[PDB]
Amino acid sequence: WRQFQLFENIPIRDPNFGGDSLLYSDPTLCAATIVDPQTLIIAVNSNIIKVVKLNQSQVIHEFQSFPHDFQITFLKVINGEFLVALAESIGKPSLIRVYKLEKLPNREQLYHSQVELKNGNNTYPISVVSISNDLSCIVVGFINGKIILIRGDISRDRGSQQRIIYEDPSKEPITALFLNNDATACFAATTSRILLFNTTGRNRGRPSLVLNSKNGLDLNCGSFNPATNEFICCLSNFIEFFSSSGKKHQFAFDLSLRKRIFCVDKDHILIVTEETIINRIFIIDAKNKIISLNFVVSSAIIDIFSTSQSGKNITYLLTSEGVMHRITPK
């Protein structure tokens, strides 16, 4: 595998680092998502949401979005129109709150729509979430192996129906969950199985396809490619590609130290590995079978997200010491 420098990595540390108005270097930051190359949304102080304009280094909106005893664990921007936030509090049902980006509220009781997620004694953390582009289909996976399917006209706040569609018999965590492009199926994995569920909720708690009956995925080792409608599965010794019909191809790769993967664009996969403890970041050109970028970061990765509004896909690596790496093709 030949290495080339076909992407540019520009590490940017929070310009407010060291002062009294921290942005994405806030040491309490628990979730982050990007709206466009100029706009970052973060969650700090357990349940405060802040809109950050990067080119100005300023918070332009902020509010408490959940009650005092809740912790935000996921933020997602859906279709450039909605902010979706999930928050948990042990022993209580988790909450999904949906907002309109253009009209964000100023206090915790105001939200466009809400989903309440019950799961047993509610001590089991959420592990994965996938949301369709119109918000009518949501899947949530948990550490005890439960998957909940939510359907309904949530974008206009007309209520939702919920259905448990999987309870892993061995109570293994759900480690990947991705809706396909028309959200008729959801790719899923545990640590020891790779699965597909149709999203009709008529499945008796059973998968529609067993994609890999012998191995699963570690956390963050699945990703999804919209351009090809494929589940990308990073195992220890190879990467597998699954379509909604079970169609399958793969290639060998030494991924013993894998921590995390991310679909960069149609052809490229970003791979995070652990090294002596630092993180090495590769980009693989799965089409031409080359390494297109290779660098290291000295800090844990909080999250990886993407923008496309500037004429190309930019990949952002948010680090836990307030450096955001911006990765751009040349």
Side-chain angles (χ1 to χ4, degrees), residues 1-276 278-330:
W1 282 73
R2 305 201 286 175
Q3 320 210 5
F4 305 91
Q5 293 149 317
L6 305 181
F7 287 73
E8 197 137 352
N9 154 48
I10 300 288
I12 306 167
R13 174 207 246 169
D14 178 358
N16 286 9
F17 189 85
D20 59 357
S21 289
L22 300 179
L23 311 178
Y24 50 87
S25 75
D26 195 320
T28 75
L29 180 150
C30 53
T33 182
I34 195 154
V35 173
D36 60 46
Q38 297 87 26
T39 314
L40 188 76
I41 307 191
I42 65 181
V44 299
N45 310 135
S46 297
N47 52 27
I48 306 293
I49 286 173
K50 299 188 177 186
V51 187
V52 177
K53 232 69 193 186
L54 292 165
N55 52 323
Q56 309 146 26
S57 287
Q58 291 173 14
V59 173
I60 62 177
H61 184 81
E62 91 180 66
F63 67 107
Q64 183 183 329
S65 49
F66 288 95
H68 65 118
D69 61 330
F70 275 84
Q71 156 90 255
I72 293 171
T73 49
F74 295 83
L75 287 185
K76 295 169 88 79
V77 175
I78 308 306
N79 198 36
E81 170 173 26
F82 298 105
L83 177 60
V84 185
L86 287 83
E88 300 168 68
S89 189
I90 182 179
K92 333 194 180 189
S94 310
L95 302 183
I96 306 180
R97 284 174 180 187
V98 176
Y99 309 90
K100 286 183 185 295
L101 281 179
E102 60 282 14
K103 170 48 201 176
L104 292 167
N106 63 356
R107 68 188 185 272
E108 167 264 312
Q109 306 95 311
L110 305 186
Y111 46 86
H112 186 73
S113 193
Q114 177 174 275
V115 180
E116 187 195 70
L117 307 177
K118 291 196 144 188
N119 179 9
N121 59 5
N122 288 320
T123 77
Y124 286 97
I126 302 170
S127 52
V128 286
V129 50
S130 184
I131 302 191
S132 74
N133 281 120
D134 64 357
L135 263 173
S136 73
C137 183
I138 305 170
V139 278
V140 182
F142 296 81
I143 286 296
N144 61 337
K146 165 173 294 182
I147 301 177
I148 297 181
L149 167 78
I150 306 95
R151 301 201 64 117
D153 193 9
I154 296 190
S155 55
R156 304 316 153 195
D157 193 27
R158 307 214 197 287
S160 60
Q161 298 177 350
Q162 295 185 28
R163 166 143 289 171
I164 296 155
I165 62 167
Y166 187 60
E167 289 179 75
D168 185 71
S170 284
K171 310 184 211 295
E172 290 180 336
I174 309 310
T175 51
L177 200 52
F178 295 90
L179 292 161
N180 70 353
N181 274 346
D182 57 13
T184 53
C186 195
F187 294 103
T190 73
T191 15
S192 55
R193 304 174 89 198
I194 305 185
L195 298 175
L196 186 72
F197 296 90
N198 79 72
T199 53
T200 71
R202 310 294 316 118
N203 58 317
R204 322 207 208 206
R206 283 148 78 97
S208 300
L209 277 163
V210 185
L211 299 182
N212 188 328
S213 69
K214 311 215 168 192
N215 292 277
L217 298 175
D218 301 338
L219 229 22
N220 306 313
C221 288
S223 192
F224 173 79
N225 191 345
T228 59
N229 212 9
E230 284 173 334
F231 193 24
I232 302 178
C233 301
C234 176
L235 280 85
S236 65
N237 306 315
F238 49 86
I239 300 175
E240 282 176 311
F241 303 81
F242 295 103
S243 81
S244 300
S245 64
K247 267 143 201 163
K248 177 182 167 30
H249 53 114
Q250 77 178 62
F251 61 85
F253 204 88
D254 172 21
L255 300 146
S256 326
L257 306 174
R258 76 202 165 282
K259 295 245 78 78
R260 178 157 200 161
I261 69 159
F262 187 79
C263 171
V264 163
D265 70 351
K266 162 183 28 68
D267 292 324
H268 295 94
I269 306 155
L270 184 150
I271 292 174
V272 186
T273 56
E274 199 153 68
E275 280 207 348
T276 37
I278 61 103
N279 288 302
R280 179 167 301 274
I281 311 306
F282 311 88
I283 296 191
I284 282 184
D285 182 348
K287 187 170 135 277
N288 296 294
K289 308 306 193 61
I290 59 183
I291 304 290
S292 300
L293 173 76
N294 178 10
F295 71 100
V296 318
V297 305
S298 47
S299 169
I301 304 184
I302 295 196
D303 204 350
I304 312 192
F305 34 71
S306 190
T307 62
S308 66
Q309 297 94 337
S310 69
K312 61 209 64 183
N313 278 16
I314 296 167
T315 305
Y316 306 75
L317 264 72
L318 176 54
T319 241
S320 53
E321 320 291 296
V323 179
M324 195 151 62
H325 298 262
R326 192 179 82 233
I327 302 170
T328 301
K330 3 223 280 197

